Amino acid sequence: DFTRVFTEEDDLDLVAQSLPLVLKVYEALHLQNPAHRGLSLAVGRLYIMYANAFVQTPAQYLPEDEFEAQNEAYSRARKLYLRGARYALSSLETAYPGFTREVFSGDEQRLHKVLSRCTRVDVGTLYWVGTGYVAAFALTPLGSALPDTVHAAVMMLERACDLWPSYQEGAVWNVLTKFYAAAPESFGGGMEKAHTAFEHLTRYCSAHDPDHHITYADALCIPLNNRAGFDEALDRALAIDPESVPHNKLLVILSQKRARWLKAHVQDFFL
Amino acid sequence: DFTRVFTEEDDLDLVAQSLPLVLKVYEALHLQNPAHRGLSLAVGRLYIMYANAFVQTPAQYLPEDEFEAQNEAYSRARKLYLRGARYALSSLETAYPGFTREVFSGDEQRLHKVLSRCTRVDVGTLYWVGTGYVAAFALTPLGSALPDTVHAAVMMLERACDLWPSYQEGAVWNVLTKFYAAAPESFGGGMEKAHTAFEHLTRYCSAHDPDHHITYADALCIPLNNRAGFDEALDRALAIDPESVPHNKLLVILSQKRARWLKAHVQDFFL
Amino acid sequence: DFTRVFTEEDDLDLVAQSLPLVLKVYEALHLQNPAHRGLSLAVGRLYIMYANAFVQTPAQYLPEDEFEAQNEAYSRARKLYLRGARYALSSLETAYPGFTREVFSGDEQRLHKVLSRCTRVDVGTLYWVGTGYVAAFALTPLGSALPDTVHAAVMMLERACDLWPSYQEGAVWNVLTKFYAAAPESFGGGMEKAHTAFEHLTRYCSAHDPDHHITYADALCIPLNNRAGFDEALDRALAIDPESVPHNKLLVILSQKRARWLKAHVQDFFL
The missing domain is CATH 1.25.40.920 (TRAP transporter T-component)
Structure with missing residues (x-):
């Protein structure tokens, strides 16, 4: 309301x-x-x-x-x-x-x-x-x-x-992907886990959602030195039109600011 | 309230x-x-x-x-x-x-x-x-x-x-004065129109109002290179005592900040 | 509430x-x-x-x-x-x-x-x-x-x-101490008055209160060039654990920021 x-x-x-x-x-x-x-x-x-x-x-x-x-x-x-x-x-x-x-x-x-x-x-x-x-x-x-x-x-x-599994268009899988990809394997992390969590996310997430694209680029592409995928993924995050989304326009705007920053700082993350 | x-x-x-x-x-x-x-x-x-x-x-x-x-x-x-x-x-x-x-x-x-x-x-x-x-x-x-x-x-x-005509002490005439004075004549502007709108404003406006003075200086004096009138008008805007106004003390304070700025920047507007 | x-x-x-x-x-x-x-x-x-x-x-x-x-x-x-x-x-x-x-x-x-x-x-x-x-x-x-x-x-x-006398753990005596210590004797100030007011404060104030320590350092130690006491008093203000106070954690945090600043600027106040 x-x-x-x-x-x-x-x-x-x-x-x-x-x-x-x-x-x-x-x-x-x-x-x-x-x-x-x-x-x-x-x-x-x-x-x-x-x-x-x-x-x-x-x-x-x-x-x-x-x-x-x-x-x-x-x-x-x-x-x-x-x-x-x-x-x-x-x-x-x-x-x-x-x-x-x-x-x-x-x-x-x-x-x-x-x-x-x-x-x-x-x-x-x-x-x-x-x-x-x-x-x-x-x-x-x-x-x-x-x-x-x-x-x-x-x-x-x-x-x-x-x-x-499907809760909030797979929002849980999103946080898990980020945790597993970023966490030391002593604390339960691991890239195989991160990838499987991301696979579940793609089953449930919206085409109007920039976050799953950003998660792919940031959590998965960066550690694996996949600059190609990083760029495509963020281009997909940025192709979304905030005026067209059914809801959470504010969060989309926030996420797109973040994807723009990642792109500007690509040189920080790859060689 | x-x-x-x-x-x-x-x-x-x-x-x-x-x-x-x-x-x-x-x-x-x-x-x-x-x-x-x-x-x-x-x-x-x-x-x-x-x-x-x-x-x-x-x-x-x-x-x-x-x-x-x-x-x-x-x-x-x-x-x-x-x-x-x-x-x-x-x-x-x-x-x-x-x-x-x-x-x-x-x-x-x-x-x-x-x-x-x-x-x-x-x-x-x-x-x-x-x-x-x-x-x-x-x-x-x-x-x-x-x-x-x-x-x-x-x-x-x-x-x-x-x-x-008299609505809110001539507030409509104020916006029209500003529009006509600033608008390309392709979009309906014109100084003659602006002056007539200002004439109506003076019939209805308050002596405690700084805005009509500022409008005179900014919309009319500047385009016509009347620096003398510009200065007098703003001196009149600034002579108003916010503590004495019957209401809208806040807007008076705002307008006086604007008139002070105009005076400081007079050299930007005349030659 | x-x-x-x-x-x-x-x-x-x-x-x-x-x-x-x-x-x-x-x-x-x-x-x-x-x-x-x-x-x-x-x-x-x-x-x-x-x-x-x-x-x-x-x-x-x-x-x-x-x-x-x-x-x-x-x-x-x-x-x-x-x-x-x-x-x-x-x-x-x-x-x-x-x-x-x-x-x-x-x-x-x-x-x-x-x-x-x-x-x-x-x-x-x-x-x-x-x-x-x-x-x-x-x-x-x-x-x-x-x-x-x-x-x-x-x-x-x-x-x-x-x-x-005891109101709010001696809060009145605190303001009076500060007034007397800082006020010209033409306006009613005086250090003897300030000290007596501080003596009343100590009867009522809390051990969890940093303010009475700061008042001692700032109002009394500075004018009297007592750098030793200044330092001890502020060390006492800073020894208080905000997580342990029964209430007004916010004010304690504020006061401790102030005591930290005083310590950093000690050279401004003594020779």
């Missing part, structure tokens, strides 16, 4: 400047009604999307010399991802008391047993919690990360896949 | 930072109640005022070398004017189904017939729609403009004049 | 960007219900806290060469303090009609008589009004200040002390 005015927006600045109080209002509603699962999820998702689009992403477009401000913005995004993930996780905690202790126990059997309690109704929540933690990890120094948190997040994502 | 806290404000930054979510809320209310004419108009007017005061105007105070950011801000204002004009136009469309097809038909007889259906009740709407389009045109490259849209906008403004 | 999401925040930017519309909404509620004392106070306090944390403080962290922007931001904070003080003062005016004429009469007997009408219920209001005026004075050129306004403000603060 109210989200349409944000998701169909083409003016980034209007969104960036209005989203903060919105986050604050949802946050307050959530704390006033901690057993409302919808509110838990909503506010969690909001922090994670804000963290990406309006904290992390602008930091990425900063110049080499201002790395200090970059690092500080990355640390800021990291904290917001985690706040977002923890807010969404309270939807699972409300539905299954003790969920948080189990899921982060480091005990594989307890992790698996608690994830087996989840149903299709929990898929949205699994997706956002797992995504929040994976997005935080991507900005976490590989030395001071928390393998058990990371492992739990991915297992939540993998559980959502089992439950509901 | 709530508008008083914005219109009597003297702190631009507080307004600039709070207006975006307000725009978003009105916008959402409008889409949730598309037959509410008041909401259509309100949100339209809001976008147009925001576009001017907080997008276009700050761009104008940028330095020569940052023309790129200037051009991008101008394109941004242009899109906001048009969104604003189109929102207000839905008030006319609600009142007279098919209004949009007629008014933009390019057929003078259909244009005139549909405008003849308008009454004094429609004057606010005519004014804002026409203003939005004229403000967009002012930022539109003379080569890629749309004569029929422009012509329809001015005819709406001229119809408001016929209906209600 | 809603204030918790602001006061426990650790992200300054989210607060800074969301507070403006909040100020505007409270302001509108206040004008719509001018006899609501709670609303008068709330909006007053809000302007004063915003003025300090998000106008004055950032100006202070600007570089030497940008003194112009600094001076303009200081003038902006000054006006906001005064708007805030005047909003809170309307709570007293509602409770005791004619309060404003009396309290600013310049007649000591009228000032004292009206302050004698105040009770413990009025302490919050006295504190905020007095603080607003003292904070404005601190940014007012010593030559164009208003001794009677300043004197009335301090007398309001001193009356709150008499009524309720």
